Design an enzyme around this catalytic site. Sequence first.
Site, PDB file in Angstrom:
ATOM      1  N   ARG A  10      27.431  37.337  -2.430  1.00 34.05           N
ATOM      2  CA  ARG A  10      27.419  38.410  -3.079  1.00 34.05           C
ATOM      3  C   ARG A  10      28.486  39.571  -2.838  1.00 34.05           C
ATOM      4  NH1 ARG A  10      25.497  43.343  -0.734  1.00 34.05           N
ATOM      5  NH2 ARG A  10      24.517  42.137   1.082  1.00 34.05           N
ATOM      6  N   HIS A  12      31.698  38.723  -1.763  1.00 38.43           N
ATOM      7  CA  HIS A  12      33.116  38.127  -1.644  1.00 38.43           C
ATOM      8  C   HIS A  12      33.424  37.249  -2.999  1.00 38.43           C
ATOM      9  CE1 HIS A  12      33.978  40.291   1.746  1.00 38.43           C
ATOM     10  NE2 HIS A  12      33.063  39.639   2.537  1.00 38.43           N
ATOM     11  N   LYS A  41      31.830  50.920   1.443  1.00 37.85           N
ATOM     12  CA  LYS A  41      32.178  49.819   2.229  1.00 37.85           C
ATOM     13  C   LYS A  41      33.581  50.109   2.096  1.00 37.85           C
ATOM     14  CE  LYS A  41      32.294  45.040   3.292  1.00 37.85           C
ATOM     15  NZ  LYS A  41      31.816  43.655   3.039  1.00 37.85           N
ATOM     16  N   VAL A  43      36.682  48.504   2.820  1.00 31.18           N
ATOM     17  CA  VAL A  43      37.499  47.348   2.641  1.00 31.18           C
ATOM     18  C   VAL A  43      36.653  46.279   2.027  1.00 31.18           C
ATOM     19  CG1 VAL A  43      39.322  45.781   3.322  1.00 31.18           C
ATOM     20  CG2 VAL A  43      39.317  48.311   3.862  1.00 31.18           C
ATOM     21  N   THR A  45      37.069  42.273  -0.345  1.00 30.47           N
ATOM     22  CA  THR A  45      37.809  40.964  -1.206  1.00 30.47           C
ATOM     23  C   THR A  45      36.927  40.495  -2.093  1.00 30.47           C
ATOM     24  OG1 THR A  45      39.804  41.388   0.432  1.00 30.47           O
ATOM     25  CG2 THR A  45      39.482  39.469  -1.251  1.00 30.47           C
ATOM     26  N   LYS A  66      40.002  36.871  13.566  1.00 33.22           N
ATOM     27  CA  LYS A  66      40.594  38.201  13.988  1.00 33.22           C
ATOM     28  C   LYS A  66      39.848  38.543  15.323  1.00 33.22           C
ATOM     29  CE  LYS A  66      42.328  40.328   9.746  1.00 33.22           C
ATOM     30  NZ  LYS A  66      42.010  41.004   8.588  1.00 33.22           N
ATOM     31  N   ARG A  85      39.997  48.775  -1.841  1.00 29.84           N
ATOM     32  CA  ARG A  85      40.365  49.693  -0.713  1.00 29.84           C
ATOM     33  C   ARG A  85      39.764  51.145  -1.049  1.00 29.84           C
ATOM     34  NH1 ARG A  85      43.090  48.230   4.146  1.00 29.84           N
ATOM     35  NH2 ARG A  85      43.339  46.352   2.796  1.00 29.84           N
ATOM     36  N   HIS A 119      31.769  34.799   6.301  1.00 23.55           N
ATOM     37  CA  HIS A 119      32.292  36.154   6.439  1.00 23.55           C
ATOM     38  C   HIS A 119      33.977  35.723   5.783  1.00 23.55           C
ATOM     39  CE1 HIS A 119      29.476  36.973   9.446  1.00 23.55           C
ATOM     40  NE2 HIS A 119      29.887  36.222  10.236  1.00 23.55           N
ATOM     41  N   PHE A 120      34.297  36.964   5.248  1.00 20.26           N
ATOM     42  CA  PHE A 120      35.740  37.051   4.856  1.00 20.26           C
ATOM     43  C   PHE A 120      36.586  37.613   5.969  1.00 20.26           C
ATOM     44  CE2 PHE A 120      39.519  38.094   2.325  1.00 20.26           C
ATOM     45  CZ  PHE A 120      39.651  36.957   1.461  1.00 20.26           C
ATOM     46  N   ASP A 121      37.600  36.910   6.255  1.00 21.38           N
ATOM     47  CA  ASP A 121      38.227  37.647   7.412  1.00 21.38           C
ATOM     48  C   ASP A 121      39.518  38.289   7.169  1.00 21.38           C
ATOM     49  OD1 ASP A 121      37.740  37.842  10.441  1.00 21.38           O
ATOM     50  OD2 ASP A 121      39.910  36.281  10.682  1.00 21.38           O
TER      51      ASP A 121
HETATM   52  O1  LIG Z   1      41.148  41.414   3.683  1.00 19.70           O
HETATM   53  C1  LIG Z   1      40.157  41.758   4.001  1.00 19.70           C
HETATM   54  C2  LIG Z   1      39.749  42.300   5.232  1.00 19.70           C
HETATM   55  C3  LIG Z   1      38.778  42.586   5.735  1.00 19.70           C
HETATM   56  N1  LIG Z   1      37.396  42.579   4.672  1.00 19.70           N
HETATM   57  C4  LIG Z   1      36.184  43.124   5.016  1.00 19.70           C
HETATM   58  O2  LIG Z   1      36.221  43.707   6.297  1.00 19.70           O
HETATM   59  C5  LIG Z   1      35.852  42.936   7.276  1.00 19.70           C
HETATM   60  C6  LIG Z   1      35.712  43.371   8.813  1.00 19.70           C
HETATM   61  N2  LIG Z   1      35.875  44.649   9.062  1.00 19.70           N
HETATM   62  C7  LIG Z   1      37.062  45.309   8.845  1.00 19.70           C
HETATM   63  C8  LIG Z   1      37.416  46.456   9.593  1.00 19.70           C
HETATM   64  C9  LIG Z   1      36.493  47.171  10.248  1.00 19.70           C
HETATM   65  C10 LIG Z   1      35.533  46.192  11.163  1.00 19.70           C
HETATM   66  C11 LIG Z   1      35.525  44.856  10.409  1.00 19.70           C
HETATM   67  C12 LIG Z   1      34.480  42.238   6.906  1.00 19.70           C
HETATM   68  O3  LIG Z   1      34.405  41.053   7.426  1.00 19.70           O
HETATM   69  C13 LIG Z   1      35.216  42.022   5.335  1.00 19.70           C
HETATM   70  O4  LIG Z   1      33.784  42.057   4.547  1.00 19.70           O
HETATM   71  C14 LIG Z   1      37.626  41.968   3.551  1.00 19.70           C
HETATM   72  O5  LIG Z   1      36.832  41.822   2.673  1.00 19.70           O
HETATM   73  N3  LIG Z   1      39.013  41.641   2.957  1.00 19.70           N
END
Ligand SMILES: O=c1ccn([C@@H]2O[C@@H](CN3CCCCC3)[C@H](O)[C@H]2O)c(=O)[nH]1
Length: 124
Positions: A10, A12, A41, A43, A45, A66, A85, A119-121
């Site tokens: 959903r 990503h 939200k 950020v 991807t 991370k 963003r 999770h997307f890192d």
């Molecule tokens: O390049 C990306 C990087 C992050 N995310 C998103 O933010 C990540 C984690 N979050 C980011 C900073 C605040 C606390 C942790 C989420 O796991 C992910 O949904 C991206 O989608 N694409």
Amino acid sequence: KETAAAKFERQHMDSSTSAASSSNYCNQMMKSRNLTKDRCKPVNTFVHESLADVQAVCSQKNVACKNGQTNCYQSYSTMSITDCRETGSSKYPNCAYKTTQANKHIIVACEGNPYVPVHFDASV
Ligand SMILES: O=c1ccn([C@@H]2O[C@@H](CN3CCCCC3)[C@H](O)[C@H]2O)c(=O)[nH]1
């Protein structure tokens, strides 16, 4: 109830478009995927590859997450992605986003049986 794997899909996955992503893309997608209900939200991807190709990343290059966990995987090939963003002027409930298309290696965290993205890192 929504599984972690389903939540990943959903938040990503967007296999429907190749890349393009109009200037409107993130504004529309963040809303429709329910990422603007509790807050904007900050950020997020979306990956424009097949679900099979993204799931396959869980058997690819093992890298540190991370958060220090060991269950992250980097794609061997670049993938079509769109970063969303939140803009500086965005005010909930009117969440506003900059849309940036790129081709990058994705890094995802995988869990479970079957072993799938949850999770997307990062992208690199
Ligand atoms: O390049 C990306 C990087 C992050 N995310 C998103 O933010 C990540 C984690 N979050 C980011 C900073 C605040 C606390 C942790 C989420 O796991 C992910 O949904 C991206 O989608 N694409």
